[PDB]
Design an enzyme around this catalytic site. Structure first.
Site, PDB file in Angstrom:
ATOM      1  N   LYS B  49       0.839  -1.193   0.000  1.00 55.56           N
ATOM      2  CA  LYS B  49       0.000   0.000   0.000  1.00 55.56           C
ATOM      3  C   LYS B  49       0.874   1.241   0.000  1.00 55.56           C
ATOM      4  CE  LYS B  49      -4.179  -1.700  -0.153  1.00 55.56           C
ATOM      5  NZ  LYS B  49      -4.154  -2.952   0.606  1.00 55.56           N
ATOM      6  N   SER B 272      -2.839 -12.671   3.340  1.00 50.65           N
ATOM      7  CA  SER B 272      -3.078 -12.536   1.911  1.00 50.65           C
ATOM      8  C   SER B 272      -1.943 -13.175   1.078  1.00 50.65           C
ATOM      9  CB  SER B 272      -3.301 -11.054   1.548  1.00 50.65           C
ATOM     10  OG  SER B 272      -2.227 -10.275   2.052  1.00 50.65           O
TER      11      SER B 272
HETATM   12  C1  LIG Z   1      -4.454  -4.029   0.033  1.00 43.78           C
HETATM   13  C2  LIG Z   1      -3.610  -5.211   0.160  1.00 43.78           C
HETATM   14  C3  LIG Z   1      -3.784  -6.298  -0.758  1.00 43.78           C
HETATM   15  C4  LIG Z   1      -4.562  -6.173  -2.059  1.00 43.78           C
HETATM   16  O1  LIG Z   1      -3.904  -5.329  -3.068  1.00 43.78           O
HETATM   17  P1  LIG Z   1      -4.714  -4.356  -4.019  1.00 43.78           P
HETATM   18  O2  LIG Z   1      -3.717  -3.742  -4.928  1.00 43.78           O
HETATM   19  O3  LIG Z   1      -5.262  -3.313  -3.100  1.00 43.78           O
HETATM   20  O4  LIG Z   1      -5.777  -5.284  -4.655  1.00 43.78           O
HETATM   21  C5  LIG Z   1      -3.443  -7.556  -0.320  1.00 43.78           C
HETATM   22  N1  LIG Z   1      -3.060  -7.799   0.963  1.00 43.78           N
HETATM   23  C6  LIG Z   1      -2.724  -6.786   1.800  1.00 43.78           C
HETATM   24  C7  LIG Z   1      -2.159  -7.081   3.174  1.00 43.78           C
HETATM   25  C8  LIG Z   1      -2.931  -5.433   1.400  1.00 43.78           C
HETATM   26  O5  LIG Z   1      -2.717  -4.521   2.454  1.00 43.78           O
END
Ligand SMILES: *Cc1c(COP(=O)(O)O)cnc(C)c1O
Ligand SMILES: *Cc1c(COP(=O)(O)O)cnc(C)c1O
Ligand SMILES: [Cl-]
Lengths: 327, 329
Positions: B49, B272
């Site tokens: 981010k 994620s």
């Molecule tokens: C926001 C983020 C993502 C997803 O990425 P995008 O480009 O916003 O789709 C995945 N995992 C984490 C921890 C993030 O902070």
């Protein structure tokens, strides 16, 4: 011809070192330039990653350990054990870390997330007690080796081969002073030796806690500046290279860390606060105008969030309103 | 002498965003595919981010939509977008207001306040819909307030098409057979996808969502434990026309994978990343993926997730533990 931005690394141990460096921007209103070497950007967010790398890699290359067979053992309530654990996981060695019972759940999870085995000692005995259990396990097992972070020759070697040459390249050969806190002393020493290699006569400055001013005329005490100021002179520290000692109160260290974040975006630990404080003291000296001072940010701030370092910031976040019936 | 982090001194921390490393996945990969991990965890505040904050601030400044010391950046976020927006505020001299519900931890509020962001706690009962409404309120009261707008902004995919995409192309030397990534805002996916089509690469583009909240597949928004992805709706940022396929990953399969990434490969990361790698490994098993290159993203470093569900199992082991007795000297 390995470049981390240009190439895919074979594994995470290849991402150790080659850390960035950033000019200190807002907090420096002197006419000296201050370069910060960001050891916080190592894979497990510590300068100690360079040390774990060196131990495993040099011991392997001197036949002194072997995968599957060897067991790495250390007594450490700080970042060295994290780094040893990390490289254990990556390189296939069983790791045992011994530490006092007072250690937080966060710092014990950090070891166990990498497969390391913990064995805890009672708090009152502290580190002499941990040191004790480490030697016990080491000589009981024919396969154990003590890492030996405070006495090993691999420590300063790695900084003379990596951290030194990197800073030299990064600054393009302009280093008029190099400032660093002394933990094991390998960073200060390794870098200093490199600078003498290439005929650079930068002033070499150690940084110690005021509450434990051992490298001067002073006795060991408690202090809250994690990672430096271990209560003695380490065997690894080459004293002759050191041109000058600067003591920093815990308080002037915490102030400085907190400003680093708020003012420069540099989120770091206690030792970093001290180093930068020292750097800025040196930069105010009149003979340092137009000169370059290099120091070290040794660790990222996130490990220190629930500690004295950011206690004052945790004051201000409670003492805040919820809102109720608005939309 | 374009910027090289190993060899140059950055002018400030924002210049250190991007140009992140990539690493092959070694031990966890029991397949005939190669898997490249793009380590967004290695950004300055340890998530992807940071690239989005950089883009918002840098592009908005250049289009005259904001000005230093005057403009106030506002976002409702209980995650990493807030930390990044905070960070760049501190660096570039803007006021930041973050709205989030009262349920957020002292750890996650410290991370903001350390950069001098302003916080506004909304009631936990109302959750994120409540934070979102406060943010819009502040922005319509204050003529100098600007909504970061992470789910809608054109800046989001743009930055990934200009940085993340090109970087991966150089690191993999042009070998990208599949790109797989979880969809939070959808910008990483979309921006990289667009870049790959720009250079004539027809890699399979794979979205990853939580199994318990499979919105891109026509299921219903639900709760899940997978911080970063699965917002509970389809973001405007996401270009669905570029997406070849969606894979769902349970929260539990995402946790197991993150825990193994640490234990087996030394890659310390969040939920994620677990999901992404799991999905990449599912694709890698496909017979047609033999000797092909699959790229995915590790979006965040693991230390932020240490007192969460992700490492709960590991915290079991370390609390129920022996000291040793009167048995030292
Ligand atoms: C926001 C983020 C993502 C997803 O990425 P995008 O480009 O916003 O789709 C995945 N995992 C984490 C921890 C993030 O902070
Ligand atoms: C080890 C350590 C240092 C000091 O570096 P040495 O190689 O021991 O000189 C500074 N602070 C922290 C956070 C440490 O982990
Ligand atoms: Cl399948």
């Amino acid at each position: 011809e390995f470049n981390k931005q240009n190439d895919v690394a074979p594994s995470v141990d290849a991402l150790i070192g080659n850390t960035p460096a950033v000019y200190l921007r807002n907090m420096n209103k002197t006419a000296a330039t201050i370069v910060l070497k960001l050891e916080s950007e190592n894979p497990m967010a510590s300068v100690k990653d360079r040390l774990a790398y060196a131990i495993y890699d040099k011991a392997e290359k001197e036949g002194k350990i072997k995968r599957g067979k060897s067991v790495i053992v250390e007594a450490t309530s700080g970042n060295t054990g994290i780094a040893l654990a990390l490289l254990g996981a990556v390189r296939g060695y069983k790791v045992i870390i011994t530490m006092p019972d007072s250690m937080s759940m966060e710092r014990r999870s950090l070891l166990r997330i990498f497969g390391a085995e913990l064995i805890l000692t009672p708090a009152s005995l502290g580190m002499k007690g941990a040191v004790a259990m480490a030697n016990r396990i080491v000589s009981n097992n024919p396969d154990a080796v003590l890492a030996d972070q405070f006495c090993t020759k691999y420590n300063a070697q790695i900084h003379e081969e990596t951290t030194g040459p990197e800073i030299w390249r990064q600054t393009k050969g302009h280093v008029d002073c190099f400032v660093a806190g002394v933990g094991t002393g390998g960073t200060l020493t390794g870098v200093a030796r490199f600078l003498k290699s290439v005929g650079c006569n930068a002033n070499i400055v150690a940084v110690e806690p005021q509450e434990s001013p051992v490298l001067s005329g002073g006795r060991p005490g408690p202090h809250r500046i994690q990672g430096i100021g271990a209560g003695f002179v380490p065997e690894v520290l080459d004293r002759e290279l050191v041109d000058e000692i600067i003591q920093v109160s815990s308080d002037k260290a915490i102030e400085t860390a907190q400003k680093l974040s708020r003012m420069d975006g540099i989120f770091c630990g206690f030792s970093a606060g001290a180093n930068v404080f020292a750097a800025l003291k040196i930069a105010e000296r009149p003979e340092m105008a137009g000169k370059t001072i290099v120091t070290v940010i040794p660790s990222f701030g996130e490990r220190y969030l629930s500690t004295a370092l950011y206690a004052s910031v945790r004051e201000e976040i409670t003492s805040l309103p919820v809102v109720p019936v608005s939309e």
